[PDB]
Scaffold this active site. Structure first.
Site, short mmCIF file in Angstrom:
data_model
loop_
_atom_site.label_atom_id
_atom_site.label_comp_id
_atom_site.label_asym_id
_atom_site.label_seq_id
_atom_site.Cartn_x
_atom_site.Cartn_y
_atom_site.Cartn_z
N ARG A 156 0.10 4.58 2.89
CA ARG A 156 0.13 4.31 4.33
C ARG A 156 0.50 5.49 5.23
O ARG A 156 0.48 5.37 6.45
CB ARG A 156 1.03 3.10 4.64
CG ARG A 156 0.37 1.75 4.37
CD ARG A 156 1.34 0.61 4.66
NE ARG A 156 2.32 0.47 3.59
CZ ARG A 156 3.48 -0.17 3.72
NH1 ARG A 156 3.81 -0.73 4.88
NH2 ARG A 156 4.30 -0.24 2.68
N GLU B 261 -4.77 4.42 -10.73
CA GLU B 261 -5.56 3.21 -10.52
C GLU B 261 -6.67 3.15 -11.56
O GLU B 261 -6.93 2.10 -12.14
CB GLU B 261 -6.16 3.20 -9.11
CG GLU B 261 -5.12 3.20 -8.00
CD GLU B 261 -5.78 3.10 -6.63
OE1 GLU B 261 -6.48 2.09 -6.39
OE2 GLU B 261 -5.63 4.03 -5.80
N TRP C 190 -9.03 6.91 -0.63
CA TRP C 190 -9.27 7.67 -1.85
C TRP C 190 -8.31 7.21 -2.96
O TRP C 190 -7.25 6.60 -2.69
CB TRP C 190 -9.17 9.19 -1.62
CG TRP C 190 -7.89 9.62 -0.98
CD1 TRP C 190 -6.68 9.83 -1.59
CD2 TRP C 190 -7.69 9.93 0.41
NE1 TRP C 190 -5.75 10.23 -0.67
CE2 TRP C 190 -6.35 10.30 0.57
CE3 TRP C 190 -8.53 9.91 1.53
CZ2 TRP C 190 -5.82 10.67 1.81
CZ3 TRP C 190 -8.00 10.28 2.76
CH2 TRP C 190 -6.67 10.65 2.89
N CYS D 28 0.80 -1.23 0.00
CA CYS D 28 0.00 0.00 0.00
C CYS D 28 0.83 1.29 0.00
O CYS D 28 1.53 1.58 0.97
CB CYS D 28 -0.94 0.01 1.22
SG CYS D 28 -1.83 1.59 1.42
C1 HEM Z 1 -6.40 6.65 1.64
C2 HEM Z 1 -5.76 6.54 0.47
C3 HEM Z 1 -5.18 5.21 -0.07
C4 HEM Z 1 -4.45 5.12 -1.20
C5 HEM Z 1 -4.04 6.27 -2.14
C6 HEM Z 1 -4.09 3.73 -1.37
C7 HEM Z 1 -3.35 3.22 -2.41
C8 HEM Z 1 -3.19 1.90 -2.72
C9 HEM Z 1 -2.87 1.35 -4.02
C10 HEM Z 1 -2.68 2.13 -5.33
C11 HEM Z 1 -2.77 0.02 -3.90
C12 HEM Z 1 -2.46 -0.91 -5.09
C13 HEM Z 1 -3.68 -1.77 -5.40
C14 HEM Z 1 -3.84 -1.99 -6.88
O1 HEM Z 1 -3.15 -1.29 -7.66
O2 HEM Z 1 -4.67 -2.87 -7.26
C15 HEM Z 1 -3.04 -0.34 -2.50
C16 HEM Z 1 -3.03 -1.60 -1.92
C17 HEM Z 1 -3.45 -1.94 -0.64
N1 HEM Z 1 -4.00 -1.06 0.29
FE1 HEM Z 1 -4.04 1.05 0.11
N2 HEM Z 1 -4.63 2.99 -0.33
C18 HEM Z 1 -5.31 3.87 0.50
C19 HEM Z 1 -6.01 3.49 1.65
C20 HEM Z 1 -6.00 2.24 2.25
C21 HEM Z 1 -6.73 1.81 3.43
C22 HEM Z 1 -7.74 2.70 4.23
C23 HEM Z 1 -6.41 0.52 3.66
C24 HEM Z 1 -6.87 -0.45 4.79
C25 HEM Z 1 -7.46 -0.03 5.92
C26 HEM Z 1 -5.45 0.12 2.66
C27 HEM Z 1 -4.88 -1.12 2.58
C28 HEM Z 1 -4.32 -1.70 1.48
C29 HEM Z 1 -3.98 -3.10 1.38
C30 HEM Z 1 -4.18 -4.20 2.45
C31 HEM Z 1 -3.41 -3.26 -0.02
C32 HEM Z 1 -2.89 -4.61 -0.55
C33 HEM Z 1 -3.67 -5.19 -1.70
C34 HEM Z 1 -3.14 -6.58 -1.94
O3 HEM Z 1 -2.43 -7.13 -1.04
O4 HEM Z 1 -3.42 -7.12 -3.04
N3 HEM Z 1 -5.23 1.18 1.81
N4 HEM Z 1 -3.27 0.84 -1.82
C1 LIG Z 2 -5.80 -8.13 -7.44
N1 LIG Z 2 -6.28 -6.83 -7.01
C2 LIG Z 2 -6.28 -6.50 -5.59
C3 LIG Z 2 -7.69 -6.21 -5.06
N2 LIG Z 2 -7.45 -5.88 -3.66
C4 LIG Z 2 -7.51 -6.95 -2.67
C5 LIG Z 2 -7.14 -4.56 -3.29
C6 LIG Z 2 -6.73 -4.26 -1.98
C7 LIG Z 2 -6.41 -2.96 -1.60
C8 LIG Z 2 -6.49 -1.93 -2.54
C9 LIG Z 2 -6.89 -2.20 -3.85
C10 LIG Z 2 -7.00 -1.07 -4.86
C11 LIG Z 2 -8.29 -0.29 -4.64
C12 LIG Z 2 -8.09 0.78 -3.57
C13 LIG Z 2 -8.58 0.57 -2.28
C14 LIG Z 2 -8.40 1.55 -1.30
C15 LIG Z 2 -8.91 1.35 0.10
C16 LIG Z 2 -7.72 2.72 -1.66
C17 LIG Z 2 -7.25 2.89 -2.96
N3 LIG Z 2 -6.60 4.02 -3.33
N4 LIG Z 2 -7.44 1.92 -3.89
C18 LIG Z 2 -7.21 -3.51 -4.23
#
Ligand code: HEM
Ligand SMILES: CNCCN(C)c1cccc(CCc2cc(C)cc(N)n2)c1
Ligand code: HEM
Ligand SMILES: CNCCN(C)c1cccc(CCc2cc(C)cc(N)n2)c1
Ligand SMILES: C[C@H](O)[C@H](O)[C@H]1CNc2nc(N)[nH]c(=O)c2N1
Ligand SMILES: C[C@H](O)[C@H](O)[C@H]1CNc2nc(N)[nH]c(=O)c2N1
Ligand SMILES: [Zn+2]
Lengths: 411, 407
Positions: A111, A285, A280, A108
């Site tokens: 964070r 994305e 957000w 993520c």
């Molecule tokens: C608030 C603004 C946030 C932004 C800009 C953000 C951004 C991202 C992005 C771009 C990804 C890549 C996912 C993809 O490309 O498919 C990701 C993954 C992830 N995010 Fe964040 N996120 C945010 C909030 C959060 C919150 C609130 C949580 C949990 C409480 C979180 C937990 C996670 C987790 C667990 C992943 C891992 C996904 C996986 O393991 O496949 N994020 N985040």
């Molecule tokens: C294989 N794709 C992963 C789908 N999962 C499990 C996943 C997990 C976390 C974040 C995302 C991308 C969507 C997302 C979620 C949140 C909370 C914030 C953000 N900026 N984007 C996707």
């Protein structure tokens, strides 16, 4: 053991001691790296050490480690495990746990915001309708008319694995996808399987290019039920480009609220199989993956046609050129309607600072480079040049199998 | 033990069996992945020779032949006597092509079998080395129709007699630290540029001065030589729509030729093994031109495009990045110098992966390095799961000679 990471742009070297606290496996060995692999009913036996570990962490963070409040809580949990085979988390523990699962989420980039997470305790929920209510409230609160707020809603934990609460949607808000008889796809190809389930469960599909899917909610191991999210609660943004007036005519829009609802939340060995969370969007994305992945909406050609790029040879970089304008359009649109969004320069730079601060105050920051680096313009962001250590800490968000594959149908 | 990799764009799954033959370590453990970290005796020697000869003789469909067994004893005798051994030309060539074949970080490996191998093990002096290198440059350059090549200098003996080319690439622009505090030319080469001057080079203190070769034979002191300018092919960089672009005064050399690595074959170490192919456009336009610690020209290109550089969110950096890369490809193609765009090269790599899995049981690959540094997810390698492991023969890193050399 100390481990060093180097940023090859700034020569900044950091030392990680936090990996020592790493428990779970990575999937890698001394003889093979699996860092690019996407996907790498508990006994009283193994449960208590997991409880103890968590509670030890918790009481250290509040500076009450080794206190009578700490010891009594261990004792209390110990007994509850021996007589009931599980235990209940205090509200304070649940909140700490949920925030730290985010803080520990190595893939993520966002964070830096981890400590500002609104925790909705939905552990008293008993029915699908109850879940719908909580989820609606989550969506209204988080959306906040465009000024988005990070939140998570936590439904009751797993017991015997036969009474799971599950949200069947991968995200709370997502566009339907329809397979046509001619083999082409209408809407979002990524959601075709899920749309088909909803349809089979009784959803009357309007069959457009951006139909908001219904919620499919399972409470207490019962069969899932369909609810439609009130349209007035689903914020959407029509996409237009600041210079290109034809862009609006592509007919694109997207929803403002990214909310993942299919992950499992592990805290102190307890498993929360329904824990939808939201934040957000980072612009890419939507503008890179959602719009331009060959297996998603796939709009590169049609955009490139309108810009009148040389589409004869790839070496004209017509794909790269169209991708940038589309991403410019997504950002311009959200900013114009005052819906929270962050560009990939801003987000990656913030993550670097966050990561540096996590090394000082915490002794490390586990990070998955493969996922942290944005899917466009990689090396002009500071994370590309940053060495990262990837390891798994608890509390954590984990993957879990899709419910339609594991569910015991009742009828 | 039989690992699978998925392409998430095409659902194609491949089964990897080749990793089981892996011998060296990755640096990762069960507890921590280091996939994004840049840099992780007679008794030693004979098993290495054996493993190598076994694969060699298996590749020629003569596993368990007299020739195989004979050669094995012959090398065994020689090690037990000389405390080393010499490769036959055939083994040497096989060795080199396989080091390239095994380079998990190389996207251009589809061409691995067409490597031209120059045997320079009879070389005894730096002038000698210079001659071999000029020949390599001329052959590989081929008036712009680039051909892959490697020149191999004598193998290490006692570590006192190492052949080293001190340059990181055969052709690179110099870099100087001006009293302003700024940096003129290539910042990546500031230190080595000083060593040339310190050893006697006279810099033209320009922006794109081709560095001189600094060659070390038999562990002796390194000597300077200037490659004949007529052998160094360069491409003035213009834009196919922006007429102002040429006033930036940018150019680049056509021949990418890495000279600082160590080639290990059958336990033997070749510390001087310069090799070359042809550029993928992003190496020049994304990394060389737009890395902050390199020529870092983004801001100035952006100004000339009169882009709104107030906010990061106008994506002005991204917009310019594309144009800069458009120009690089345009200029090289216009002057007929082989170059490949990141779309073509990654599509080629996918085809190669498929060939390798179906004909060798897998293909070691480092996703972190294979995914190009721009427009990552619109290339097919982004969606391709890859397994990274270490096979021999191999190219390895080795310490910079100046830190090691005893004058
Ligand atoms: C608030 C603004 C946030 C932004 C800009 C953000 C951004 C991202 C992005 C771009 C990804 C890549 C996912 C993809 O490309 O498919 C990701 C993954 C992830 N995010 Fe964040 N996120 C945010 C909030 C959060 C919150 C609130 C949580 C949990 C409480 C979180 C937990 C996670 C987790 C667990 C992943 C891992 C996904 C996986 O393991 O496949 N994020 N985040
Ligand atoms: C294989 N794709 C992963 C789908 N999962 C499990 C996943 C997990 C976390 C974040 C995302 C991308 C969507 C997302 C979620 C949140 C909370 C914030 C953000 N900026 N984007 C996707
Ligand atoms: C012919 C066209 C070729 C292309 C397009 C190509 C492309 C690339 C690229 C883009 C990289 C990433 C390195 C970086 O970004 O700095 C790389 C790495 C590498 N290449 Fe290739 N290459 C080619 C030929 C060769 C040849 C002929 C050899 C050896 C004989 C070779 C061996 C290697 C090795 C060993 C690495 C990784 C070095 C490391 O571990 O850091 N390549 N290549
Ligand atoms: C950052 N890596 C260190 C530089 N090294 C050791 C290195 C090694 C191999 C390739 C490269 C990139 C330059 C290059 C070389 C060759 C032969 C072809 C090509 N297209 N690019 C660089
Ligand atoms: C920190 C990270 O390992 C470093 O920036 C790597 C990332 N990927 C790369 N990929 C290529 N092709 N070349 C590089 O120099 C790098 N640098
Ligand atoms: C094979 C590879 O791991 C896979 O395509 C990954 C690469 N990096 C990613 N990065 C992000 N942010 N999201 C993704 O889905 C992926 N997918
Ligand atoms: Zn690893």
């Amino acid at each position: 053991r100390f481990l060093k990471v180097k940023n090859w742009e700034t020569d900044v070297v950091l030392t990680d001691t936090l990996h020592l606290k790493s428990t779970l496996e990575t999937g890698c060995t001394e003889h093979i790296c699996m860092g690019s692999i996407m996907l790498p009913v508990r006994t009283k036996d193994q449960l208590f050490p997991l409880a103890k570990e968590f509670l030890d962490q918790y009481y250290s963070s509040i500076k009450r480690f080794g206190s009578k409040a700490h010891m009594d809580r261990l004792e209390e949990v110990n007994k509850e495990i021996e007589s009931t085979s599980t235990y209940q988390l205090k509200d304070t523990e649940l909140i700490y746990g949920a925030k730290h699962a985010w803080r520990n989420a190595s893939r993520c980039v966002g964070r830096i915001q981890w400590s500002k997470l609104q925790v909705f305790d939905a552990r008293d929920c008993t029915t699908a309708h109850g879940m719908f209510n909580y989820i609606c409230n989550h969506v209204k609160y988080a959306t906040n008319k465009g000024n988005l707020r990070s939140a998570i809603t936590i439904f009751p934990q797993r017991t015997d694995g036969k009474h799971d609460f599950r949200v069947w949607n991968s995200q709370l808000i997502r566009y339907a996808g329809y397979k046509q008889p001619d083999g082409s796809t209408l809407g979002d190809p990524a959601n075709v399987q899920f749309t088909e389930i909803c349809i089979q469960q009784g959803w009357k599909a309007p069959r457009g290019r951006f139909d908001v899917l219904p919620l499919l909610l399972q409470a207490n191991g019962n069969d899932p039920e369909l609810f439609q999210i009130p349209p007035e609660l689903v914020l959407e943004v029509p996409i237009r480009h600041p210079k290109f007036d034809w862009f609006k005519d592509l007919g694109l829009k997207w929803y403002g609220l990214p909310a993942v609802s299919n992950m499992l939340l592990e805290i102190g060995g307890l498993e929360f199989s329904a824990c939808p969370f939201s934040g957000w969007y980072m612009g890419t994305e939507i503008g890179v993956r959602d719009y331009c992945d060959n297996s998603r909406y796939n709009i590169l050609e049609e955009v490139a046609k309108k810009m009148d790029l040389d589409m004869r040879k790839t070496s004209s970089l017509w794909k790269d050129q169209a991708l940038v304008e589309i991403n410019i359009a997504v950002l311009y649109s959200f900013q114009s309607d005052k819906v929270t969004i962050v560009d990939h320069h801003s987000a990656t730079e913030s993550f670097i600072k966050h990561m540096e601060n996590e090394y000082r105050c915490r002794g490390g920051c586990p990070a998955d480079w493969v996922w942290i680096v944005p899917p466009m313009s990689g090396s002009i962001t500071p994370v590309f040049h940053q060495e990262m250590l990837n390891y798994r800490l608890t509390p954590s968000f984990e993957y879990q199998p899709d419910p339609w594959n594991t569910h015991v149908w009742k009828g």
